[PDB]
């Protein structure tokens, strides 16, 4: 209905080139943070198994 508004997605024809390493390292650091939170006693309240 609201296709004329373009209010949902933004287009990036900006080259989808080599970023995989970037969020890949980000996944490293996020997993490290998750381990820290789990070791801090935050399992089930801050981070779940899913």
């Amino acid at each position: 209905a609201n296709w004329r508004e373009r209010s949902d997605l933004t287009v990036t024809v900006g080259i989808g080139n080599m970023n995989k390493d970037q969020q890949m390292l980000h996944l490293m650091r996020i997993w490290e943070m998750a381990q820290a939170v789990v070791g801090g006693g935050g399992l089930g309240v801050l981070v779940s198994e899913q």
Partner: protein
């Protein structure tokens, strides 16, 4: 506050939806988890020994 920090880090990383990697502490599941954790603090080992 910790949840907000984690949300900010995740969003800066490039993931707009933060619930995929973190759990809101105000969600009912988190409240249930806190209730269970608090209930598991009934009494340590020497309590009835001393009483």
């Amino acid at each position: 506050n910790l949840y907000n920090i984690l949300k900010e880090v995740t969003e800066n990383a490039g993931y707009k939806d933060p619930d995929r990697f973190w759990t809101n502490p105000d969600s009912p599941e988190a409240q249930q988890a806190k209730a269970i954790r608090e209930q598991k603090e009934a009494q340590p080992k020497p309590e009835d020994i001393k009483a």
